[PDB]
Amino acid sequence: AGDRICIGYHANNSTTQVDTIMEKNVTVTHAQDILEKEHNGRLCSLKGVKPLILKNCSVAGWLLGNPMCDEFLNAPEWSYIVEKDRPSNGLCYPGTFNYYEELKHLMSSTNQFEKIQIFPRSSWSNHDASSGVSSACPYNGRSSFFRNVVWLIKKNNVYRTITRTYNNTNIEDLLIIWGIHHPNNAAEQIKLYQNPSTYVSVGTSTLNQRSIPEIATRPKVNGQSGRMEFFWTILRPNDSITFESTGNFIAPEYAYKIVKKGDSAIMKSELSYSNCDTKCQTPVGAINSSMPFHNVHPFAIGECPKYVKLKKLVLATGLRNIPQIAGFIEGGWQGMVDGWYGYHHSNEQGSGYAADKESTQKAVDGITNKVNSIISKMNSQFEAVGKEFNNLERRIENLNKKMEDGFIDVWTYNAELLVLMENERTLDLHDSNVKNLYDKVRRQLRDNAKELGNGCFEFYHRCDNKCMESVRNGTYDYPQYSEESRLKREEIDSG
Amino acid sequence: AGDRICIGYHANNSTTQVDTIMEKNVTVTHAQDILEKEHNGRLCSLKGVKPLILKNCSVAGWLLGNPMCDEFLNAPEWSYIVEKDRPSNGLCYPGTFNYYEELKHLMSSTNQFEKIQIFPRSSWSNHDASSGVSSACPYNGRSSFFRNVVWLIKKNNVYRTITRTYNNTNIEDLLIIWGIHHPNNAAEQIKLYQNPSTYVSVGTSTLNQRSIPEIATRPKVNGQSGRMEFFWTILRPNDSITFESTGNFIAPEYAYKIVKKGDSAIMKSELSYSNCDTKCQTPVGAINSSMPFHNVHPFAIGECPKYVKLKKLVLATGLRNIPQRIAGFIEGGWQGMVDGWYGYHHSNEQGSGYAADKESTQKAVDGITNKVNSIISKMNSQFEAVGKEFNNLERRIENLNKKMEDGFIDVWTYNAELLVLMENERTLDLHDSNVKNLYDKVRRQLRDNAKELGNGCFEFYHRCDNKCMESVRNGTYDYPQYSEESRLKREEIDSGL
Amino acid sequence: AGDRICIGYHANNSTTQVDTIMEKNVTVTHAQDILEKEHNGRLCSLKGVKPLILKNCSVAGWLLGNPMCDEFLNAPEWSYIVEKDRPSNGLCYPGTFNYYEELKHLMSSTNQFEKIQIFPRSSWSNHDASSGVSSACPYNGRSSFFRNVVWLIKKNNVYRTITRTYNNTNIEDLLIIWGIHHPNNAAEQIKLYQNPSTYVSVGTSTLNQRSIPEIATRPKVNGQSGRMEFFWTILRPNDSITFESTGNFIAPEYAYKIVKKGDSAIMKSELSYSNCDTKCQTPVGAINSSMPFHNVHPFAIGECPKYVKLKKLVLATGLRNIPQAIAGFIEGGWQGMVDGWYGYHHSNEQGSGYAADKESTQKAVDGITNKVNSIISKMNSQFEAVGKEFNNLERRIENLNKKMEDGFIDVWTYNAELLVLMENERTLDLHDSNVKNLYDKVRRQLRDNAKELGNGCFEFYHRCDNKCMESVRNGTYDYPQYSEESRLKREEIDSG
Ligand SMILES: *[C@@H]1O[C@H](CO)[C@@H](O[C@@H]2O[C@H](CO)[C@@H](O)[C@H](O)[C@H]2NC(C)=O)[C@H](O)[C@H]1NC(C)=O
Ligand SMILES: *[C@@H]1O[C@H](CO)[C@@H](O)[C@H](O)[C@H]1NC(C)=O
Ligand SMILES: *[C@@H]1O[C@H](CO)[C@@H](O)[C@H](O)[C@H]1NC(C)=O
Ligand SMILES: *[C@@H]1O[C@H](CO)[C@@H](O)[C@H](O)[C@H]1NC(C)=O
Ligand SMILES: *[C@@H]1O[C@H](CO)[C@@H](O)[C@H](O)[C@H]1NC(C)=O
Ligand SMILES: *[C@@H]1O[C@H](CO)[C@@H](O)[C@H](O)[C@H]1NC(C)=O
Ligand SMILES: *[C@@H]1O[C@H](CO)[C@@H](O)[C@H](O)[C@H]1NC(C)=O
Ligand SMILES: *[C@@H]1O[C@H](CO)[C@@H](O)[C@H](O)[C@H]1NC(C)=O
Ligand SMILES: *[C@@H]1O[C@H](CO)[C@@H](O)[C@H](O)[C@H]1NC(C)=O
Ligand SMILES: *[C@@H]1O[C@H](CO)[C@@H](O)[C@H](O)[C@H]1NC(C)=O
Ligand SMILES: *[C@@H]1O[C@H](CO)[C@@H](O)[C@H](O)[C@H]1NC(C)=O
Ligand SMILES: *[C@@H]1O[C@H](CO)[C@@H](O)[C@H](O)[C@H]1NC(C)=O
Ligand SMILES: *[C@@H]1O[C@H](CO)[C@@H](O)[C@H](O)[C@H]1NC(C)=O
């Protein structure tokens, strides 16, 4: 009829929820979100270094010096490059650009260009380096031409065969770009370069190529029915390059020196620049976040969290919050805040709550050991930077898309399952911890007290604030109340 | 004995077996196999849409119209394309087909061609459109030729320059195929085309080309020593194509309108179609899609289960089956229980009793079927592999493709296997917990009113008929009611009775 | 007050430490490291078959017969090809080898060449097969040239058109290599081959190609400003190849028969063969492949363990070591107990002594050594990387291939780390459960005839001696037969 002690556990006001492999929407005591899902809608600069936003200039446009990309004629250093989905200013004069995508992929490994001149327009004596302009490349008004290459026209009805060498004495790699003109007619050829059969031969310690003009009738594009095929090579230091040509040569006036290699990318965003700083950016926005995961977009540059195709990823830190003298068989105690598991005693003197400090900090330490482990354990999740492919590279494009989405699916599965399988185990680690300290108080006071069936013990010898601490301490001396209790339960047996 | 209650669990004779991570081959009561292992050996329609059967024809054969191959004159829609692995009827006149494999890949995202005329054979008045036939492409026995292109010959010992344009007035894309002829020797060039230096030249909005013949002396394939190189493009709508040739031109007569882009495939299979239909086609037969997994072939088309390199995959859904060849759950299952996974065996008088904790039984069943659904949910969005062809100088990217597909098939085969193995051990781990929770539920109520035997039953320190039974099942047991009765019970045997 | 039976479990001297998901450095009685971490720094034969050591030669130099490179006249088979990272003898005459990477791939699935003659060097009755030499291909001072091709030159200011056929009347596939010569100017063209307009054409069933020489003026490399481009095809059996050329032709003298196709590889190492043998080799050395996993280097060939980028990976097998008036499992483990994992202790009238529960201890050894093999087993199929090479202009697929080699490595490191951690947890929690379930075997037998002392021991109310102890150990305590004696003494203890 008195002097008791109950085993119980923390409950509270929370209603955050987690999931388990078996049961879903389980309400828990505490729970951490590990998935960031919010991004500012702005293109920011990575680690203090601003991107190169090309507005609607294509990279081809940029590198060739399209007459409408004059903004980026001398572009500074860049963290990343943002091209729009379909840039408007590219090859204004129709034609193609060989190994284009392979060139853009090299850019992702470079951070700064120093454009230097090798063949000054002034050096084209014995040819016409002035009239080579067209209405396909208007400046302001009409008819200009790419700024970084020159279109050589016959002069005084002679196109003397050209031979010109340049020597990278620099210590940095050089990017050189040249082209060849594909005219409409047998007549347009003679009119432009006099000689009917021509060729453009370029030479490197690496690169041996001859090009001959494929001459044909075509639909006009941006006004023109002819086309220019463009070529590029990387000339290493101490290496030299030799051009020889009898016509249709589009020669380079400039080259780009690769002054800073390193991490970079080309992102496909129609957004534009804002004045912020970020450690991780995305086609749709930047991310301030210490979360281990995010779900805003597969592509992301910089030191940043790690993308998952999921809508929620919350981890269970505390108890199933099932709030309800009573004991743990009927629910959790709201009246205890000291810890996760603890006791309630009654006695002659008065009642009170007390946490099992030993078990709860071990819980805390063992739960923190898991969450910190999991988050910053497997850091090698498949992060990426995308790439482009041309109209006859479809199979390897798919190969790439197939693989990229392949690892996306694998890692999200890994994340989802770990969260669900660990939510299941912490939730019944808690369950177990409250059972074990129930057993530690019953193996202490043995037949000195009566199992009630609610999680509570009535005593046969009545003990207070020192023996209550003594049962809480794992210190309770059974032989001291041995024969005191024996007399009461021997009295209880008769009446 | 005087009045007992027992707690025990369902058993039956079901020799279904499951594996777990720790132990193998454990006989359960209930188990859901989830791995389809069978196929029907036929090639079928895909939910009503028939596959395009090329029989003995290669894709190149069909498109160029090799006389041994037939035309799909109704212009059907297909669900997939079946080609023999080594098709007899391809480029009957020897040559090659540039970016053949890229084109074949395009086909896999297309479901319906309609063939149209762009250059009628009756429109080459300036040249010979009839004599360009050959013994390597027979028909009636007579020497014939590809039906979709035209071998133009010098007319009257003259080969006037050819300029023709075609404008895609349609809203559909157009696949156009033309070629060039490579003769044996300088004399053949003159004999067929007069002009001894020639080119074939095409101009679209984004394609630019001027190709010239390569004279070599070659072994006789199919009886000819000259060759034919073929090219294809896609002429986008509102665009135009212009051909310039001064000899050796193999002119397109037709063109194919892509009128359905969709999900399609090129299966390489030797079988032939019969009247069946399926949700899921593989090269060696069709399989049912009732189950989430199959091990029949990694290339399957349609609403398919997910493929895993495994021989068995059985999900434990019930209990262990340890029956007794009386006592409760410490010696194993009762087959006396019909409805209910966890029940009682109340004994009062010399007959019997077998109930079922209906409640904790329908809490296990409502989570085992729940979590099962959740397992099959978690994989679906797995890796599915895709057919793709390569040639003899793309052996690297071919190997990359194959390593990556075997790669992900291995990952998920491991993922699925280890996921069920764990769910099997934890599904049975929950029955042991569930039965031990049934025992303790009664125990917390009865206290010193009943005696524990290490058996799973409680002999009663008083009398309990049917109503007292249902009371302890429903958790509504009045210890302070029989307490007094039970105490005098208990004192008799402690003294000597 | 006496006569005891205590439930306990094993301890020992172990320093060893495993990890779980929520515990780090946990000391266990027994464990098993499963990650190979060292190598011998030698390069070895692969189970009795030696690698092809190219020394300082590229695959090109070896195949074409660069003079500094040696013939493998013995036609040996090989396990794997070893080539340095920047070999020093390649295309001594500067030039290009088309689809070179494609060729090496074929090599990496090829295990034995036999070299055969197809166009004997003496056979060019109307051309110069001897002046074709260069200062860029020095063999012992004087000028020389690739030993397996022949640089055919005009005889007496004449280059009669060339047309030669070879029929493959072997059963194997043949590799045939040929090439073409791009001169510096139009002058040297006529100086070597006279005929100014020229070509080199190759016919097979599956090969049509006529190259024409690209004359430009290039930088000098190993002395030369001309260049030679090389080609290769694979001529199927019963097929013919016929070459037509009016100049600049570099005719093969020899062909290679692929006589053994199979598993091979091209390793990039700088070591040298060491008169040793292994089951698994890596560019840095051979590894002792008897663990299931290693972290030595990603590219490893042969019957190899599965590679993971961990620094440590060790399974749990025995109990958690917590040793230290005898008490049961609640105070920890018994260093006294040796013959098993779980078991009992008696403290009766004859003395004290430990006994193991073999029946339960074995079902635990049975399983745990089972689950071990089952972890080596479901990594039977993991992911092993294969060497592939690419040129600049294939830098996109090169990255694609390395993003995905790295991707699978990372996935499988995750799984291996995560599987060991999680079953370490379940191994220990298993031991927990057995020790508990052992206690209850005794607690449900003895029933009202013993009291539970709350530390894993029982005090019998009756006398027990040796064979009733053996009785409860054996799962057959005759409780009908001592309740009498116990019923007496509980009444004795409840008052007196
Ligand atoms: C490989 O090439 C080198 C240089 O072309 C050869 O010469 C020796 O190379 C080593 C490098 O391992 C140098 O340190 C020595 O000084 C060189 N000479 C001598 C006499 O040792 C080397 O012989 C070639 N072969 C091999 C198998 O390395
Ligand atoms: C819950 O209780 C806390 C006080 O401990 C209070 O600050 C908070 O606003 C309450 N509301 C919710 C939604 O948790
Ligand atoms: C689970 O929780 C979410 C959030 O409240 C809710 O939308 C959903 O209906 C819940 N349960 C089920 C079975 O969908
Ligand atoms: C190109 O960018 C400019 C920048 O002001 C923008 O005004 C324009 O809308 C873009 N082009 C087109 C065709 O919309
Ligand atoms: C290029 O410069 C290097 C020295 O920097 C020199 O060795 C080489 O001869 C030069 N080449 C030419 C064509 O001037
Ligand atoms: C497991 O038992 C099945 C009986 O269904 C038998 O076919 C199989 O061989 C056994 N496998 C093992 C590994 O014991
Ligand atoms: C699919 O199920 C039907 C009955 O629903 C069965 O007759 C048929 O054999 C099954 N298909 C296969 C491939 O086993
Ligand atoms: C396809 O070729 C095989 C091989 O000769 C032949 O048996 C079969 O009849 C051919 N099919 C048709 C429709 O010609
Ligand atoms: C197609 O028609 C003619 C070709 O004769 C051409 O002049 C015209 O501009 C084209 N128009 C289109 C493609 O809309
Ligand atoms: C094609 O051209 C017509 C008229 O020039 C135009 O109305 C139509 O939208 C265009 N469609 C495409 C797909 O180019
Ligand atoms: C585990 O052992 C290593 C060995 O000294 C030590 O560095 C580490 O701190 C230990 N434990 C933890 C919890 O990190
Ligand atoms: C290889 O194995 C043997 C025997 O297991 C051992 O003695 C030796 O030290 C090992 N060496 C290396 C380098 O792994
Ligand atoms: C090589 O084969 C050709 C054609 O395949 C044949 O005519 C001849 O028998 C063979 N040549 C020689 C020289 O045997």
Rounded to whole angstroms, the Cα distance separating A281 from C103 reads 42
User: Would you call B404 and A402 a contact, using CB atoms and an 8 Å cutoff?
Assistant: yes
Calculate how far, in angstroms, residue C239's C-alpha sits from the geometric centre of ligand 13.
Answer: 9
From C53, A105, A417, select the one nearest B381 (Cα to Cα). Answer: A417
Residue C410 DSSP SS3: helix
Question: How far apart are the CA of A458 and the nearest CA of chain C, in angstroms?
Answer: 18
Q: Is the four-CA dihedral C344, C349, C350, C351 of positive or negative sign?
A: positive
Q: What are the structure tokens assigned to B453, written together?
A: 């035997």
Residues of B (315-374) whose Cβ lies below 8 Å from C: 330
* Ligand 1 atom nearest to C270, measured from its CA: 28
Pocket test for ligand 9, best of B118, B165, B168, B242 (most atoms within 8 A of CB): B165
Cross-strand partners of A260: A112
Tell me which of C21, C419, C435, C492 to substitute to probe the interface with A (most A C-beta atoms closer than 10 Å): C21
* CA B38 remoteness from chain centre: 13
Breaks (C-N over 2.5 A) in chain B follow: 325
Q: Is the CB of A56 under 6 A from ligand 4?
A: yes
Phi, psi of A119 (to 5 degrees): -120, 85
d(CA A83, CA A104): 11
Query: What is the experimental resolution, given in Å to one decimal place?
Result: 2.8
CB B41 within 8 A of CB B85: no
| Domains annotated on chain B, with CATH | 1-49+272-497 (no CATH), 50-271 (3.90.209.20)
Q: Does residue C35 belong to the interface with chain B, where contact is any CB pair within 8 Å?
A: no
Torsion over CA: A399, A403, A404, A405 (sign): positive
Quick check: B382 and A216 CB within 8 A? no
> How would you class B475 by CB atoms within 10 Å of its CB: exposed for 0-12, middle for 13-18, buried for 19 or more?
exposed
Token pair for B6: 């027992």
**Cβ distance of C397 and B399 shorter than 8 Å:** no
Cα–Cα distance measured from residue B93 to residue B146, given in angstroms and rounded to the nearest whole number: 9
CB contact under 8 A, A227 and B242: no
| Residue closest to B40 by CA, chosen among B206, B306, B358, B273 | B273
Q: Which residue has the tokens 């008799």?
A: B492
Could you tell me if the CB of B165 is within 6 A of ligand 9? yes
Select the residue of A101, A208, A443 nearest C182 (Cβ to Cβ).
A208
Return phi, psi of residue A236, to 5°.
-75, 165
How do B314-316 and B333-334 pair as beta strands?
Answer: unpaired
* Helical (H) or strand (E) element with C428: helix C395-446
Across the interface, of B393, B411, B454, the residue whose CB is closest to C102 is: B393
**Among the partner residues A241, A382, A422, nearest to C410 by beta-carbon distance:** A382
Task: State the distance between the two ends of chain C, measured CA to CA, in whole angstroms.
Answer: 13
- Phi first, then psi: what are they for C108, rounded to 5°? -65, -5
Please provide residue B361's backbone torsions phi and psi, each rounded to the nearest 5 degrees: -70, -45
Among residues C15, C26, C3, C9, the alpha carbon closest in space to that of C336 is found at C9
Interhelix angle A394-442/B100-107, nearest 10 degrees: 60
Taking Cα atoms as reference points, which of A357, A410, A188 lies closest to residue C414? Answer: A410
For every residue of chain B, which 3-state class applies, written as one string? CCCEEEEEEECCCCCCEECCCCCCCEEECCEEECCECCCCCCEEEECCECCEECCCECHHHHHHCCCCCCCCCCCCECCCEEECCCCCECCCCCEEECCHHHHHHHHCCEEEEEEEECCCHHHCCCCECCCCCEEEEECCCCEECCCCEEECECCCCCCCCEEEEEECCCCCEEEEEEEEEECCCHHHHHHHHCCCCCCEEEECCCCEEEECCCCCCCCCECCECCEEEEEEEEECCCCEEEEEECCCEEEECEEEEEEEECCCCEEECCCCEEEEEECEEECCEECCCCCCEECCCCCCEECCCEECCCCCCEEECCCECCECCCCCCCCCEECCCCCCCEEECCECCCCCCCCCCHHHHHHHHHHHHHHHHHHHHHHCCCCCCCCCCCCCCCHHHHHHHHHHHHHHHHHHHHHHHHHHHHHHHHHHHHHHHHHHHHHHHHHHHHHHHEEECCCCEEEECCCCCHHHHHHHHCCCCCHHHHHHHHHHHHHHHHHCC
Chain breaks in chain A (C to N over 2.5 A) after: 324
Chain B, nearest residue to C412 by Cα? B411
